[PDB]
Design a protein around this ligand. Structure first.
Ligand code: NAI
Ligand code: FMN
Ligand code: SF4
Ligand code: SF4
Ligand code: SF4
Ligand code: SF4
Ligand code: SF4
Ligand code: FES
Ligand code: FES
Lengths: 226, 227, 139, 156, 439, 120
């Protein structure tokens, strides 16, 4: 029952605009008798969509005045660019004409919570243990986006962040390779000197190859120059 | 507020300018430099309408609809002959230096400049002189750069600097040698640099990842989805 | 004025004759580029209007066309009656060298029109095609 | 590799003392670097941006906007001849032809030895004594094509 | 020609050897008496009202009233920070008056800036000066240092408690910087793009603060008003425009120079009685009254008083009132080509009609110069004149660009029609495609 | 140049192609197939072509035994010469830089002026 709002996130598969479905592709969609002609000259059956109100064809509705909230793409006659979204809005720069899609699952509660009494103690750098400070990257921390080949040229090379005091204590410079063991597995990374990172912490790029996001807030042992 | 466009009365928001008020009413005014999220600057001079002082007025005055408030009791004309001639002239001035690039341009069929050139009714070229050209920059793996197609509408710099808070994009140079890009070759550092491919009304900033396996907008199968 | 200009054709004598016979509020004149007067008639007055056009001094003697239109997706219907469907009747007077297009508006649930076959016999096949392709019943 | 000198940095900071916004000293900072080094090299843009606390794109836009800030290497002496309307009536074309004959270059180009850089310029505000030219800091009026070769040798 | 202080308030204390007048000689010749009177015995609103009813108009070239511009400052006491700017740019071709006014009389400008800053309650003042006026910059900085040493500038000026700091900001060579909003943008260290008005700089100018921009000659007219009175300034000339004005003829005349004349002086006396007429063997063809951005006028308009309203009704503008004479030897097409080349290369690039239409006119005039003109070129120039007028571009640079072109087309159309020789051709033949032969 | 104008202008939809790009930057069709069993020989694709690449030629003898063999790939379409338009070249008009033709080298083009140039 807590997920009961997902019924109204979009209308069901029987929803129509004056009897017709919602088109997935523009009216001037081309190559319909040739896009699959090398596999067979016989045109295949148009893919049926029993799940949703959209159709896998142009035989549908994408009018800007159509009473719906799910707009697959914005096109209007004379407006082929993204400026056709002006035609799809009630006022330009406002909302969609018949409401924005999506429904909030919960409202604001009538009463609040109590104050959280458990105030933590201050961070104390213990010898031989390195607190893992999470460093997130827009290109590299999300799991599936790493798999995108265009992100590898944009993803930074993975280093480890060190305080100048901790790096001087360990005798390591910027760029040298240090090896650390987490869960009994030694891995090696180069070093950058992070001035803003507090001493007793080591900075790790979350979500990269070999570094799980679960490592945030964990501790490190035997981190030393390889 | 109450406005009268071409003899038709409309009720609009008085806090809006005339361009967004008329676009919200379904009227078609060509525009380049205005964006709903960026505000009005009055650069491209494309959104000209003829404003009259009162209902019994024949002369009028050409004004920028994006810079003119949609106050109560306004009188304007979009389809006035002089206003149409000026909008066509602005499109013609933008076309003097524009490259012959639409077949090999990723913005083709999705281009705001194409749509406004067609909308003003400008299809005859009388300019016979040379067109200015520009070298391109390497902007990283995501954005492809082609400064020949620029119409100097300043939307990229306004979005990237004022809206997105980026620092490595700017406008350089002078009179008709205005260059929009980075001070040197390199990757655009903003996390929201990809919106330039929709902010730019021409094919200057394009999706390089799409440009690898390119197809036109009419050939796409679209669906509404969540990132 | 060019030949393609949008005209209401209110200067046509047939508009004045229809106004004198049925009243100013009995029909709506639509401005088009068809070159003919387009007159929206109520469904219950269609046979009377057809008979009146048939008995004019220079009468409309030929039913040139009869078909339907699905108006449900039509966005620009300014100056038009409310209609989910419509049926149009193109009638030609050869003695006047003129023609008129009558139009009947139909709701989606009430898709029935009186038949025109008692006035013009070619309305048989025209109404059969309108029923076939649009689902409009002709009583 | 570019490095601002101590005198350059002190002059730039003293210029930022004159305004309520440090961005307002960008033109004077570029002019200070140009005065010290003849022109503004590529690393000077980033150095001035780092000193002023503004993006380097803003400094580059300012430097490429103003014609008297040189973003390309120039000669040891810059001739700037007026090509505006009053000096056109007074005949700057003979002066320009004499300069192109003596220096054997075109406007916008520099000499082979790097001695002179020839440039057209806007009106110098000396139209009643035209034609006028501006070598590095000195303005010369009442120019004649015969006096140009004599005038050029006093700038070694 | 004797120059009494009664009728030549600006140029009477000039020296015959063209040497600058420093603080001792300036104060000897009735220096800072108007500043003393304004800063001791007059309220700032009283000084603003005195300037308003004295009829002092803007000497930049627009003729806007100085007191009216001063009165539009906000009355809020929370807006303490205020800026006064002196437009010493003077980048218009044919204009050389501020160079003379600041190279030899810098203390007059300093006194006028002091009086105007006290009247406007301007806490800071800047002199936006072009970078080519090196000697003027040296003289202005020396005069500022001398006035600060004597206590006329800085903190507690002459016991009043008013604090005023005056700086000199040297430009970097751009013509559009003379426009007041573009001047404000350039002062802030930005690219000199102009701004849309409203809001005007009096409400939110430099760094968002109330700012007043005035020409050198307006601020040099201020101390004479504050020292000799409003009724003296109103009685200098019996015309609508009050006070004197720096006028002068330049370009192939006998005496190309600059003089100070009352408003309402006809243009024939400036050309003949002062500049000595044309040179030997050259006859008069045309003249521009107020610099490069004004309409050309013929010899029939030479019998017209140099007022804003008189030249405005003649189809031109008074401008800076520094007229330029064009003789019969100068080709009008080449002259207009030079003017439009200057105007096109000094565009700031913000708005489409100037940025993309001035180069089109430049290329058309280049073709007309070489005899490569084609039919429709003059029609294109006239269309550019119509569509680059006021209200169509973002600022007033492009209307001033198209004023001389349209005036020369109006008065000398036979010279422009002589350049059209070739038939109009925009396309080449493509083999295999028959062209659409439009008739 | 694989601009896809012929494919969309085809009323039968019997043209399918994909854009590819060489290292110099010129656009070309990676594949180009025409379903001649569907084609009505209306000439709308040749009319729509902005480079005069696709052309309808005086050849009617196109009979076939199997319908699959009426799908003509790019190896069956690309001929050795210019066809009916012997001299037109789109890449001498386009502003895009390709091999042997840099910026400013197309028709009615000026050489690019750097913003760092000393000229006002
Ligand atoms: N070397 C020079 O001095 C040059 C002078 N000019 C002159 O500049 C003129 C154009 O000047 P602009 O400032 O562009 O235009 P403008 O004529 O609108 O403004 C001139 C002055 O009037 C003031 N002003 C006008 N209306 C106002 C209002 N409602 N509220 C507050 N202040 C107001 C402005 O603040 C400004 O100081 C041209 O007509 C030309 O004569 C042009 C080029 C060079
Ligand atoms: C393109 C352009 C250039 C201008 N250049 C100057 C200039 O160089 N010096 C100047 O005093 N005014 C110049 N002005 C006029 C100013 O906008 C403004 O009127 C002046 O600086 C102060 O006005 P004032 O005459 O009332 O003192 C220019 C205006 C325009 C449109
Ligand atoms: S930006 Fe638009 S008009 Fe320019 S070449 Fe590309 S598609 Fe054509
Ligand atoms: S690059 Fe695009 S967004 Fe930027 S000014 Fe040019 S046309 Fe406008
Ligand atoms: S007219 Fe337009 S482009 Fe030209 S200087 Fe003014 S704002 Fe800049
Ligand atoms: S000729 Fe054939 S391939 Fe070309 S548009 Fe017509 S049907 Fe399509
Ligand atoms: S054949 Fe012509 S129209 Fe078709 S994709 Fe190639 S260049 Fe474009
Ligand atoms: S949209 Fe109004 S001037 Fe650009
Ligand atoms: S025109 Fe040359 S100095 Fe003014």
């Amino acid at each position: 029952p807590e997920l009961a709002g997902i019924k109204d996130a979009a209308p069901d598969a029987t929803f129509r605009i004056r009897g017709q479905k919602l088109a997935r592709e523009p009216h001037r969609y081309s190559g319909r008798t040739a896009m699959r002609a090398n596999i067979s000259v016989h045109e295949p059956r148009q893919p049926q969509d029993i799940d949703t109100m959209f159709t896998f064809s142009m035989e549908g509705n994408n009018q800007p005045t159509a009473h719906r909230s799910q707009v697959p793409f914005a096109w209007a006659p004379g407006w082929n660019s993204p400026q056709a979204w002006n035609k799809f809005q009630d006022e330009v720069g406002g909302k969609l004409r018949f409401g924005d899609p999506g429904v909030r699952l919960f409202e604001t509660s009538e009463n609040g919570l109590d104050y959280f009494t458990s105030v933590p103690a201050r961070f104390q750098p213990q010898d031989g243990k390195w607190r893992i400070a999470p460093y997130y990257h827009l290109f590299g921390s999300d799991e599936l986006s790493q798999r995108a080949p265009v992100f590898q040229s944009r993803m930074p090379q993975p280093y480890i962040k060190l305080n100048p005091a901790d790096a001087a204590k360990l005798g390591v410079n910027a760029g040298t390779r240090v090896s650390f063991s987490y869960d009994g597995n030694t891995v090696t990374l180069p070093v950058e000197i992070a001035e803003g990172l507090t001493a007793g912490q080591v900075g790790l790029p979350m979500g990269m190859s070999g570094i799980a996001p679960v490592l945030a807030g964990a501790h490190l042992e035997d981190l030393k120059e390889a | 507020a109450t406005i009268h466009v071409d003899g038709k009365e409309y009720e609009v928001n008085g806090a809006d300018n005339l361009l967004e008020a008329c676009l919200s009413l379904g009227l078609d005014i060509p525009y380049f430099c205005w964006h709903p999220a960026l505000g009005s600057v009055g650069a491209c001079r494309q959104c000209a309408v003829k404003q009259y002082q009162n209902a019994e007025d024949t002369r009028g005055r050409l004004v920028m609809s994006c810079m003119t408030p949609a106050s109560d009791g306004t009188f304007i004309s979009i389809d006035d002959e002089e206003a149409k001639q000026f909008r066509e002239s602005v499109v013609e001035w933008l076309m003097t230096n524009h490259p012959h690039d639409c077949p090999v341009c990723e913005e083709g069929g999705n281009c705001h400049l194409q749509d406004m050139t067609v909308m003003t009714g400008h299809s005859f070229r009388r300019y016979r002189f040379t067109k200015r050209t520009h070298r391109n920059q390497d902007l990283g793996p995501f954005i492809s750069h082609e400064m020949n197609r620029c119409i100097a509408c300043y939307r990229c710099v306004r979005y990237y600097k004022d809206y997105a808070g980026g620092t490595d994009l700017g406008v350089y140079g002078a009179h008709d040698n205005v260059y929009f890009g980075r001070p040197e070759d390199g990757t655009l550092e903003s996390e929201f640099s990809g919106n330039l491919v929709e902010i730019c009304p021409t094919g200057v900033f394009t999706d390089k990842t799409h440009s690898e396996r390119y197809n036109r907008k009419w050939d796409m199968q679209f669906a509404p989805s969540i990132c | 004025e060019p030949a393609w200009q949008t005209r209401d054709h209110l200067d046509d004598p047939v508009i004045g004759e229809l106004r004198n016979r049925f009243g100013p509020d009995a029909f709506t004149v639509q401005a088009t580029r068809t070159g003919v007067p387009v007159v929206w008639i109520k469904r219950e007055q269609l046979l009377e209007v057809g008979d009146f056009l048939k008995k004019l001094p220079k009468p409309y003697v030929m039913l040139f066309d009869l078909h339907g239109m699905d108006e449900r997706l039509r966005t620009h219907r300014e100056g038009l009656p409310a209609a989910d469907f419509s049926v149009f009747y193109h009638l030609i007077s050869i003695d006047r060298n003129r023609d008129i297009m009558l139009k009947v508006a139909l709701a989606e649930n009430d898709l029935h029109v009186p038949t025109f076959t008692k006035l013009f016999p070619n309305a048989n096949w025209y109404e059969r095609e309108t029923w076939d392709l649009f689902g409009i019943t002709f009583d | 590799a570019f490095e601002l000198s101590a005198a350059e940095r002190e002059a730039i900071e003293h210029e930022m003392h004159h305004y309520e916004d440090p961005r307002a000293a960008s033109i004077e900072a570029l002019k200070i670097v140009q005065k010290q080094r003849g022109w503004v090299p590529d690393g000077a843009i980033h150095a001035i941006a780092d000193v002023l606390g503004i993006p380097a794109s803003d400094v580059e836009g300012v430097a490429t906007f103003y014609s008297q800030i040189f973003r390309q290497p120039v000669g040891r002496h810059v001739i700037r001849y007026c090509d505006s309307v009053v000096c056109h009536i007074n005949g700057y074309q003979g002066i320009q032809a004499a300069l192109e004959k003596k220096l054997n270059i075109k406007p916008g180009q520099t000499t082979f030895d790097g001695r002179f850089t020839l440039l057209p310029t806007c009106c110098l505000g000396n139209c009643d004594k035209g034609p006028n030219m501006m070598i590095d800091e000195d303005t010369h009026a009442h120019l004649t094509p015969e006096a140009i070769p004599e005038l050029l040798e006093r700038y070694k | 020609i004797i120059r009494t202080p009664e009728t030549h308030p600006l140029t009477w204390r000039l020296r015959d050897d063209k040497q600058p007048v420093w603080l001792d000689e300036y104060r000897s010749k009735n220096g800072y008496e108007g500043a003393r009177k304004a800063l001791t015995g007059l309220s700032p609103d009283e000084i603003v009202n005195q300037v308003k009813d004295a009829g002092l108009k803007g000497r930049g070239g627009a003729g806007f009233s100085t007191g009216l511009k001063w009165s539009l400052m906000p009355k809020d006491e929370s807006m303490n920070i205020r800026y006064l700017l002196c437009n010493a740019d003077e980048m218009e071709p044919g204009t050389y008056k501020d160079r003379l006014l600041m190279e030899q009389l810098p203390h007059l400008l300093v006194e006028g800036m002091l009086i105007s800053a006290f009247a406007l309650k301007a806490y800071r003042g800047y002199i936006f000066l072009r970078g080519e006026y090196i000697e003027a910059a040296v003289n202005l900085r020396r005069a500022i240092a001398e006035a600060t040493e004597a206590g006329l500038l800085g903190k507690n000026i002459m016991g009043t408690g008013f604090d005023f700091e005056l700086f000199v900001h040297t430009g970097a060579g751009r013509y559009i910087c003379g426009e007041e909003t573009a001047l404000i943008n350039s002062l802030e260290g930005r690219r000199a793009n102009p701004r849309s008005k409203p809001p005007f700089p009096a409400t939110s100018g430099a760094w968002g603060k109330p700012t007043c921009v005035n020409n050198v000659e307006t601020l040099c007219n201020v101390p004479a008003i504050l020292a000799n009175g409003v009724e003296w300034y109103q009685n200098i000339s019996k015309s609508k425009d009050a006070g004197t004005k720096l006028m002068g003829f330049s370009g192939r005349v006998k005496n190309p120079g600059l003089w100070e004349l009352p408003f309402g002086t006809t243009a024939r006396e400036i050309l003949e009685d002062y500049a000595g007429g044309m040179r030997d063997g050259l006859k008069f063809k045309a003249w521009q009254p107020g610099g490069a951005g004004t309409d050309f006028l013929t010899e029939a308009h030479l019998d017209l008083p140099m007022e804003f309203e008189s030249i405005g009704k003649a189809g031109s503008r008074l401008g800076t009132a520094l007229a330029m004479a064009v003789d019969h030897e100068i080709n009008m097409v080449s002259l207009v080509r030079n003017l439009e080349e200057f105007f096109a290369r000094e565009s700031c690039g913000w708005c489409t009609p100037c940025r993309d239409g001035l180069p089109w006119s430049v290329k058309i005039l280049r073709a007309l110069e070489r005899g490569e003109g084609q039919p429709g070129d003059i029609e294109t120039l006239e269309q550019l004149c119509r569509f680059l007028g006021p209200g169509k571009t973002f600022c007033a640079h492009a209307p001033g660009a198209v004023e001389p072109l349209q005036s020369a087309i109006k008065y000398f159309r036979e010279e422009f029609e002589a350049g059209i020789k070739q038939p109009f051709s925009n396309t080449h033949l493509i083999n295999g495609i028959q062209p659409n032969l439009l008739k | 140049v694989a601009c896809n104008l012929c494919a969309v202008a085809c009323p039968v939809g019997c043209i399918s192609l994909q854009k590819a790009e060489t290292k110099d930057g010129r656009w070309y069709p990676e594949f180009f197939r025409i379903n001649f069993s569907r084609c009505i020989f209306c000439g709308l694709c040749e009319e729509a072509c902005p480079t005069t690449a696709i052309q309808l030629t005086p050849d009617f003898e196109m009979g076939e035994y199997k319908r699959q063999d009426l799908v003509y790939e790019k190896e069956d379409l690309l001929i050795s010469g210019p066809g009916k338009y012997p001299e037109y070249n789109f890449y001498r008009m386009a502003g895009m830089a390709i091999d042997g033709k840099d910026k400013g080298e197309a028709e009615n083009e000026a050489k690019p002026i750097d913003v760092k140039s000393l000229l006002p």
